[PDB]
């Protein structure tokens, strides 16, 4: 004959360190792909960035982070910005344009903190940021010379990173 069936679902999991390491792992991939074509950032630096991103994603403090090359106060291609979001679609890292004019630009990282980071007491931040690899200077936000292309989104259990790539104008 034939039959139908019903199913059960487990309890929805709280965002965890594994989820944070799943998204940060794909970020480090994009930084290494960028290094292969533009010599930056360093392998040792990529790990420090990945480890910082895990701490911040796990704590919920993060809002937006950007990595790439900048002239003056303006990001230039290649430059990858990842935005935290509540929402699922998960993609494979990559799609980095090569051959772009690096010129006299340098590599720089800028990070924007979430609403939760701003409300939390500073004693509370230290317990959550206990395992951070390095301390970070603040308040020098760059601009974007070209337009912005949303190409990839990485999604963990609860949360997602929406990435936009800076595209030089032609």
């Amino acid at each position: 004959n034939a039959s139908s069936y019903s199913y059960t679902v487990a309890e929805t999991q709280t965002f965890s360190v594994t989820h944070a390491r799943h998204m940060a792992a794909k970020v480090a991939t994009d930084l290494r792909r960028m290094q292969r074509f533009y010599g930056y950032p360093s392998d040792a630096d990529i790990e420090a960035y990945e480890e910082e991103l895990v701490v911040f994603l796990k704590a919920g403090y993060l809002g937006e982070v950007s990595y790439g090359f900048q002239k003056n106060n303006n990001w230039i291609e290649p430059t990858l910005r990842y935005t935290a979001g509540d929402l699922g679609t998960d993609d494979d890292p990559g799609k980095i344009r090569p051959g772009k004019d690096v010129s006299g630009a340098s590599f720089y990282s800028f990070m924007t903190y979430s609403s939760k980071y701003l409300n939390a007491t500073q004693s509370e931040k230290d317990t959550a940021l206990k395992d951070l690899p390095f301390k970070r200077v603040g308040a020098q936000s760059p601009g974007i010379n070209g337009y912005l292309e949303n190409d990839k989104t990485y999604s963990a259990g609860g949360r997602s990173l929406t990435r936009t790539s800076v595209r030089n104008f032609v």
Partner: protein, 303 residues
Amino acid sequence: VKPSLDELFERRINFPDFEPQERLARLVGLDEHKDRLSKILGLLVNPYGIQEWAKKYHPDARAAVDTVLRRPPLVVLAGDVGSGKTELAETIGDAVARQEDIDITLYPLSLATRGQGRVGEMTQLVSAAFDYTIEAADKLKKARGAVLLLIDQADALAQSRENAQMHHEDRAGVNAFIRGIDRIANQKLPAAVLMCTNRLKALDPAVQRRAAEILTFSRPNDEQRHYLLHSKLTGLGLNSTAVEELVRLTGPRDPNSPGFTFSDITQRLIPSIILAAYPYNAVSVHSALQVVNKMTPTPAFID
């Protein structure tokens, strides 16, 4: 996360309105069904009307009138295909809304209440749909307004639990369907559930006993076919002898043959007569005779 109105209930219809009034009046041969349906629905809105009737005609029967009001407000529209079950169920609230001087909202139950396979999902979707029905009527309870819960694909939702080819969740969905009906009757709310089925026998016995009234829809007789053809063949230059011929031929040609349905006459025969003439010819009597003889009525259910 409560399920929303739209997921459970599709799109609601409001009364009175111009469209439902126009469609209801076009129904041919459902006069005794309209009166029956408007009596029950009118008595739920305004109980005093029947109470006054008892006083004038049967003052001694105090228990009798209480039985009419306390029944579960369920009616079942069953019968042949294309007979007017869905059309009457949809538009009947309009004639009730105008005579009782109130506005009626019709909630048409969606098939999304079956769920997508989670354990218990159907039972909680069906339950939540009755809750909305009861919320809307609880505010309205002379009644300020009336609420109609429509279930046009009724055989899919309420299926006899004795059937072997159905999940446990299908049987729990009938039970949830039952309890929701009992829940509406227990309260005084002015809400009535109407359900239509092509196969009355497929419905569950526990559902069928709660049916305050069961209305049987059948294919049109010679009178109803004559009125229906005469109404819509006007202006096509077809004489009285021709329409009489078309009425004979659109009937059962054998004890076995079922005979033409209402929808077969309106939604098949007439437009096929027009399309044969379209677009370079007028409707001809000879064309109409050719079209009827080609065409066969829709086969009926075995049950």
